[PDB]
Design a protein around this ligand. Structure first.
Ligand SMILES: NC(=O)c1ccc[n+]([C@@H]2O[C@H](COP(=O)([O-])OP(=O)(O)OC[C@H]3O[C@@H](n4cnc5c(N)ncnc54)[C@H](O)[C@@H]3O)[C@@H](O)[C@H]2O)c1
Length: 336
């Protein structure tokens, strides 16, 4: 019990890294299933549980977890939108996240999606595999010929700004409620209203969190106000884009391409192999089938450095918990 971790939403990459980095003699119970009320029993007698972005740390499961001997929750990710902190606080349970995995991983993936919808290397790859070497349809653009707008000049945003403005010499505009200095210091200009981003930008990448303001940022109102042939990247939170609006945009031609590593109803799909079963989500089924849409299963973060840091940090969180030395930066809630 005292040294046992039950790790929910296990996959081979989790096992591989958590073992490699487990230098502290911890017993790890890897559960393939996700942490929901049907699964929370598997943690019985486990002092610590480790969860990921799509686990269900709801009031009831937390209560069960506490009523069965677990005392610390380990978020092996920086997000916690699905953890009822209040239940945890009242039960004296710390939740401990990994606030800082390499943001370059997410920014350079966002670039990846741009390059891919641009030069269409996947399309090329799918054709050549079928012995079709015709390149009609794969005309791209020089990177400097488009105006990139970044919404959210934070930790990931800032990086995408550097690589663009610095690596290609492109014209880059930012919209943010604050104003990251690193962005203004390399001659990138901020616009006061998003309405300017639409008017001026050819490819837009979103790097804000999801909140009552940013939700459905991309919708019919804004899509209409956008340029023709706009490319939209979104590797942040799926709900920044109203997918059915986005489809209308794509159908009517207003939107040239769409790249998303995240999706509003992603919880019932990502990370799992569901071949042979009908996706019942029609927007998601359609987006996947459209030929100018990149949809990937929330993997922008998955580099060697990011997952090494994630696992190593969660394990470290456990040892900190037990030496009563929790790092302020990793404690999300406030238990008694
Ligand atoms: N694997 C993945 O796909 C993955 C990995 C890490 C982070 N993310 C997502 O990327 C998003 C941002 O990442 P980050 O680490 O750079 O966060 P961050 O705190 O460093 O930056 C968030 C920025 O959004 C700015 N902003 C501008 N307008 C805003 C508005 N109207 N409402 C709220 N914020 C506004 C804020 O000032 C802030 O700087 C996160 O929401 C996170 O969910 C995805």
């Amino acid at each position: 019990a005292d040294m046992k971790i039950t790790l929910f939403s296990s996959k081979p990459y989790w096992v591989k890294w958590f073992n490699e980095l487990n230098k502290f003699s911890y017993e790890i119970n890897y559960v393939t299933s996700a942490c929901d009320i049907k699964s929370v029993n598997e943690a019985k007698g486990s002092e610590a549980v480790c969860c990921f972005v799509n686990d269900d740390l709801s009031k009831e499961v937390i209560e069960t977890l506490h009523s069965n001997g677990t005392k610390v929750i380990l978020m092996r990710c920086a997000g916690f939108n699905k953890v009822d902190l209040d239940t945890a606080n009242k039960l004296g349970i710390p939740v401990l996240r990994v606030p800082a995995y390499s943001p370059n991983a997410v920014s350079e993936y966002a670039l990846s999606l741009i390059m891919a919808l641009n030069r269409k290397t996947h399309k090329a790859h799918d054709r050549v595999r079928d012995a079709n070497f015709e390149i009609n349809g794969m005309e791209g653009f020089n990177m400097v010929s488009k105006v990139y707008g970044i919404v959210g000049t934070g930790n990931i945003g800032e990086q995408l700004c550097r690589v663009l403005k610095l690596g290609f010499g492109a014209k880059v505009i930012a919209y943010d409620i604050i104003e990251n200095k690193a962005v203004t210091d390399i001659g990138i200009e901020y616009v006061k209203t998003l309405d300017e981003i639409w008017k001026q930008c050819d490819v837009i990448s979103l790097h804000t969190p999801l909140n009552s303001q940013t939700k459905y940022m991309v919708n019919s109102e804004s899509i209409e106000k956008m340029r023709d042939g706009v490319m939209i990247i979104n590797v942040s939170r799926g709900a920044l884009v109203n997918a059915s609006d986005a489809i209308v945009g794509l159908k009517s031609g207003k939107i040239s391409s769409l790249g998303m590593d995240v999706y509003e109803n992603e919880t019932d799909y990502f990370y799992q192999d569901h071949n042979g079963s009908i996706i019942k989500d029609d927007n998601l089924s359609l987006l996947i089938s459209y030929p100018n849409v990149m949809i990937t299963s929330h993997q922008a973060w998955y580099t060697k450095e990011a997952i090494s840091c994630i696992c190593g940090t969660s394990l470290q969180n456990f040892v900190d918990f037990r030496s009563n030395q929790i790092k302020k930066s990793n404690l999300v809630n406030n238990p008694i």
